[PDB]
XYZ file of C-alpha atoms in Angstrom:
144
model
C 0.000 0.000 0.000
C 2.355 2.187 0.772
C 5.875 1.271 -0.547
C 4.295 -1.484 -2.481
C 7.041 -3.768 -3.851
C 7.851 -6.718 -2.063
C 9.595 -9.936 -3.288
C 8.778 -13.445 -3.046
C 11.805 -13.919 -1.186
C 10.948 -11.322 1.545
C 7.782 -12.894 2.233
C 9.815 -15.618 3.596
C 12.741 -13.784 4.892
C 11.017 -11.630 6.853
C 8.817 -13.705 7.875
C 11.458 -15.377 9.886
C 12.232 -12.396 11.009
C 8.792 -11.933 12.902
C 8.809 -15.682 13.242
C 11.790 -15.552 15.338
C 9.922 -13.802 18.151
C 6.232 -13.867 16.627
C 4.362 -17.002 17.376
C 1.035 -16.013 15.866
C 3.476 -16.794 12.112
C -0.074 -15.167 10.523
C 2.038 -12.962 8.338
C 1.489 -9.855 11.071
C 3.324 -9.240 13.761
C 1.705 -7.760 17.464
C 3.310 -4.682 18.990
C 4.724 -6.781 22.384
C 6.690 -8.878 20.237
C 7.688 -6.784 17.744
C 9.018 -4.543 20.551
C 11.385 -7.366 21.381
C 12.439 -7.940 17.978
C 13.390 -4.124 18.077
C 14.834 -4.134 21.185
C 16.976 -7.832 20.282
C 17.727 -5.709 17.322
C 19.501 -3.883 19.265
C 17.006 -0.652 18.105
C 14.716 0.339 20.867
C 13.989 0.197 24.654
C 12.412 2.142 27.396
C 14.956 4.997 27.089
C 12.867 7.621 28.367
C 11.650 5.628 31.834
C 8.380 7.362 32.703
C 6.180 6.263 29.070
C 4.858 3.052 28.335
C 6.775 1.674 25.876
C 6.795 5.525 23.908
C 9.905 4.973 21.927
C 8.475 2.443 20.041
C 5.232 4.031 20.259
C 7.021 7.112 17.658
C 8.107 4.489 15.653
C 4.775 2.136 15.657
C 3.040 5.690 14.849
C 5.088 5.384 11.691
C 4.448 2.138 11.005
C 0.819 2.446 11.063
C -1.330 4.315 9.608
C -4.779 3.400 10.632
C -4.357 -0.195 11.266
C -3.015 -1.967 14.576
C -0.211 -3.807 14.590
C 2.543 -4.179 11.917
C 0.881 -6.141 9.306
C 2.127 -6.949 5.728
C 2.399 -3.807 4.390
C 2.940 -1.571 8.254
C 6.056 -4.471 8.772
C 7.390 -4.364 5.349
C 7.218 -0.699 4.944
C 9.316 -0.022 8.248
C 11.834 -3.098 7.331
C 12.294 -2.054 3.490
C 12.331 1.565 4.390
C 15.233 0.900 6.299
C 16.614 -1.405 3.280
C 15.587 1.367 0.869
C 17.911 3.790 2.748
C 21.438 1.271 1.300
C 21.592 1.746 -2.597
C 22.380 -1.139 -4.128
C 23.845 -1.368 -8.221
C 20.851 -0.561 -9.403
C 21.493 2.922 -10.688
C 24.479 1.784 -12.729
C 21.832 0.058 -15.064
C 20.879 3.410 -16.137
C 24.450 3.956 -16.189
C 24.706 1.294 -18.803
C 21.960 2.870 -20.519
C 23.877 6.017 -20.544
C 27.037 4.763 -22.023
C 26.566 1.498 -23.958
C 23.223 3.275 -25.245
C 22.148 1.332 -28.881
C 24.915 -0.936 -28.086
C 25.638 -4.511 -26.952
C 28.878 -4.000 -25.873
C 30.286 -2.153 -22.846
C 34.120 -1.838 -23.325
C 36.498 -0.470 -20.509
C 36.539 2.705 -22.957
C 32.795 2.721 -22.020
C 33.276 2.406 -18.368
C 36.401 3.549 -17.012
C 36.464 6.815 -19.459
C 32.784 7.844 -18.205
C 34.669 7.776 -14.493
C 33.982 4.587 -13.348
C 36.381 3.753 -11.690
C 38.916 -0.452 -11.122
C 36.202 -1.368 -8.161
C 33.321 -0.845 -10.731
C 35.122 -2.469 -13.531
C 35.555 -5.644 -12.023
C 32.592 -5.790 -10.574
C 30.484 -5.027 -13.378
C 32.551 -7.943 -16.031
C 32.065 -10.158 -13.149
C 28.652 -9.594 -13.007
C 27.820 -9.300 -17.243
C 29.709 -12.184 -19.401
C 33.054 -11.014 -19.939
C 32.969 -11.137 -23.903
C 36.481 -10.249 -24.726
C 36.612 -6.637 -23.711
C 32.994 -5.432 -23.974
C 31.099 -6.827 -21.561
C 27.743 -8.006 -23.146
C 25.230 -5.694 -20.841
C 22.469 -6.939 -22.727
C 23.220 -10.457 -21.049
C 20.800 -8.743 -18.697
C 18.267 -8.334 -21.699
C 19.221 -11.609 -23.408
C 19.767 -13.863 -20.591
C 22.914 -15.437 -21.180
């Protein structure tokens, strides 16, 4: 609902994550529990000694919106939004898009020229089929 876009694999990743400490398994987690899956997290605690449980309380506020309990979008929203936050490679695609545009071929004249730098290089002809020099980018595309 909100950051719609889940994968299969989540759905049973996390899943063990509430699992671990959830013993309902329905797919939704309660707040007790989830407090202690926080809190083993090594996130949140009763800092503030005088509220009930408030730090998580600013968070859970967060988490949901008009529901009760972190449920399979209110979990998934708080666990990818904190996944969301580390990039991963998936800008360089439109990297590749930039460069190697109308071509096949991604040469080291492609990459390392448009300032990508050794770290990327290897990486990226790990990654896509090293076909002589000019990586074949559309193995992405083409599946090979």
């Amino acid at each position: 609902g909100s950051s719609s876009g889940v994968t299969a694999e989540q759905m049973q990743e996390f899943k063990q994550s509430f699992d671990a400490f959830d013993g309902n398994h329905d797919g939704i987690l309660d707040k007790l529990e989830f407090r202690s899956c926080l809190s083993s997290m090594g996130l949140i605690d009763i800092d503030f000694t005088g509220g009930e449980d408030a730090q998580y309380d600013a968070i859970y506020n967060n988490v949901t919106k008009g529901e009760n309990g972190v449920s399979f979008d209110n979990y998934v929203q708080y666990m990818k939004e904190k996944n969301d936050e580390n990039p991963s490679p998936e800008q360089l695609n439109e990297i590749f898009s930039t460069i190697a545009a109308g071509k096949d071929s991604i040469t080291e004249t492609d990459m390392q020229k448009a300032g990508m730098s050794a770290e990327q290089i290897e990486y990226v002809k790990a990654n896509l089929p090293q076909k002589g020099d000019g990586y074949d980018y559309a193995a992405w595309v083409k599946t090979n």
